[PDB]
DNA sequence: GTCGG
DNA sequence: GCTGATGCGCA
DNA sequence: CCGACGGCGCATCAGC
């Protein structure tokens, strides 16, 4: 991490803009800077050097000069010094507590995990769960364990129906050594009329075998919940998302959820060059959805040699 | 906050 | 009771 | 100087 000091400062600034200031555009601006600096192959010696980078402007360059010179930033020092900011920032670490709920709680005098634990009544189902598994949800997931989770998900899916396709995407599919969570895409030849229970079947099964232990949200296309490898020292509970998408939106969905949100941004960047527009559902000339029967295909559009998953962090 | 308009 | 309004998390 | 900057599935609940 050639410039981790700087990207950490920028990311703590972004979090503050999102969580306290509720300025989502600044939050994004700061994350854009952090990413262009994290991808930069030199050790930055000055703000003027960073300023060459797109996403890095006047203000950020100046903060960079201060950090490189002092090793700190007075603004972040001040922020972290304030009770309200620091408390609002912290509470958003609970899944289900956003900037609005965090700010409501703090104003009520509820500012800590203890306070939360001492006010179950003012928490909704999702927030109770994020609290219950606060530490767990902050832990990384070793690849060895992801491979084991993947096993259970593919197998139980098969047991419901021999046609379902399940693919684990996100950091996992990129070959990453650890994951923040598990992201599962699901398709089935019958869904491209409609039918209920298509996702519900898979969810119910995984519950039956005690893999999925908690539900955060659930509808006919998206499941958000908690899961755990069977057991010795219990394994930590983990976040899992499952998405049911139309079989004809498969590769666009897989490509998009594979991860490297960065990679996404710039494959989007080069999309509108040969005049294309790609989202998670389709690639369009906008026009009607161009035929997609591979990840290479989507590339074929904007020229562009096929990147394999484990290469697309960039 | 940054960048194109 | 209802539902329009809003919050939340997520590549 | 100034406006654009991603959208959506699902859950909750203030104000009828
Ligand atoms: Cl903003
Ligand atoms: Mn207290
Ligand atoms: Mn993930
Ligand atoms: Mn995810
Ligand atoms: Na710049
Ligand atoms: Na949160």
* Cβ-contact A159, A202 below 8 angstroms: no
Q: Whole-angstrom distance between the N-terminal and C-terminal Cα of chain A?
A: 15
A88 CA → ligand 2 middle, Å: 14
* Alpha carbon separation from A273 to A85, A91, A260, A277 (Å, rounded): 42, 42, 21, 9
Same domain, A155 and A210: yes
Query: What is the rounded CA–CA span in Å between residue A294 and residue A85?
Result: 47
Ligand (nearest to CA of A113): 2
Q: Please state whether strand B lies within 7 Å of residue A55 at its CB atom.
A: yes
Pair A76, A4 in one domain: yes
The alpha carbon of A113 and the centre of ligand 2 are apart by a number of angstroms equal to 9
Six-digit token string for A47: 């703000």
Tokens of A131: 């609290």
Asked whether residue A240 falls in the same domain as residue A276, the answer is: no
User: Token pair for residue A76?
Assistant: 């972040």
How many angstroms separate the CA atoms of A33 and A226, rounded? 32
Are residues A262 and A249 part of one domain? no
Beta strands A165-169 and A283-284 are unpaired
Contact between the CB of A262 and strand C at under 7 Å: no
Whether residue A131 sits in one domain with residue A73 = no
The residue range of the domain holding A72 is 1-82
| A217 and A233 belong to one structural domain | yes
Are A251 and A272 in the same domain?
no
The number of beta carbons lying within 10 Å of the beta carbon of residue A313 is 16
Nearest to A250, CA basis, from A175, A189, A171: A189
Question: DSSP letter string over A34-60?
Answer: HHHHHT-SS---SHHHHHTSTT--HHH
Tokens of A24: 């989502």
CA angle in degrees (0–180, nearest 5) for A311-A146-A268: 35
CA of A21 to the centre of ligand 1 (A): 9
Å between A98 CA and C9 C1'?
A: 9
Farthest CA pair distance, chain A: 63
Domain shared by A155 and A191, yes or no: yes
Contact call for residues A33 and A56 (beta carbons, < 8 A)? yes
Note if A63 is an active site residue: yes
Q: Is A94 annotated as a binding residue?
A: yes
Overall residue count recorded for chain A in this entry: 314
Find the helix or strand (DSSP H, E) in which A167 lies: strand A165-169
How many domains, chain A? Answer: 4
Q: How many CB atoms lie within 10 A of CB A62?
A: 12
Closest CA to A51 of A38, A39, A69, A64: A64
Experimental method: X-ray
State the nucleotide closest to A36 in CA–C1' terms: B2
Under 8 Å between Cβ of A186 and A166? yes
**Both structure tokens of A282:** 């389709």
């Amino acid at each position: 991490t050639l410039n981790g000091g700087i990207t950490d400062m920028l990311t703590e600034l972004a979090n503050f803009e999102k969580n306290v200031s509720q300025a989502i555009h600044k939050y994004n601006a700061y994350r854009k800077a952090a990413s262009v600096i994290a991808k930069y192959p030199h050790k930055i010696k000055s703000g003027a050097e960073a300023k060459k980078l797109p996403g890095v402007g006047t203000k950020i360059a100046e903060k960079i000069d201060e950090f490189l010179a002092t090793g700190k930033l007075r603004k972040l020092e001040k922020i972290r010094q304030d009770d309200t900011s620091s408390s609002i920032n912290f509470l958003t670490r609970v899944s289900g507590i956003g900037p609005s709920a965090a700010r409501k709680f703090v104003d009520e005098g509820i500012k800590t995990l203890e306070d939360l634990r001492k006010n179950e009544d003012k928490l909704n189902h999702h927030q109770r769960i994020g609290l219950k598994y606060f530490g767990d949800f902050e832990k990384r997931i070793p690849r060895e364990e992801m491979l084991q989770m993947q096993d259970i998900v593919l197998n139980e899916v098969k047991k419901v129906d021999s046609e379902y396709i399940a693919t684990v995407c996100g950091s996992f599919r990129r070959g990453a050594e650890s994951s923040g969570d598990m992201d599962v895409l699901l398709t089935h030849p019958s869904f491209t009329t409609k039918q209920p229970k298509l996702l519900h079947q898979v969810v119910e099964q995984l519950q039956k075998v005690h893999f999925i232990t908690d539900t955060l949200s659930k509808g006919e296309t998206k499941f958000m919940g908690v899961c755990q490898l069977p057991s010795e020292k219990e394994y930590p509970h983990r976040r899992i998302d499952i998405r049911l998408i139309p079989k004809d939106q498969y590769y666009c969905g897989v490509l998009y959820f594979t991860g490297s949100d960065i990679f996404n941004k710039n494959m989007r960047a080069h999309a509108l060059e040969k005049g294309f527009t790609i989202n998670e559902y389709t690639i369009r000339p906008a026009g009607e959805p161009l035929p997609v029967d591979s990840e290479k295909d989507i590339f074929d559009y904007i020229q562009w040699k096929y990147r394999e998953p484990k290469d697309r962090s960039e």
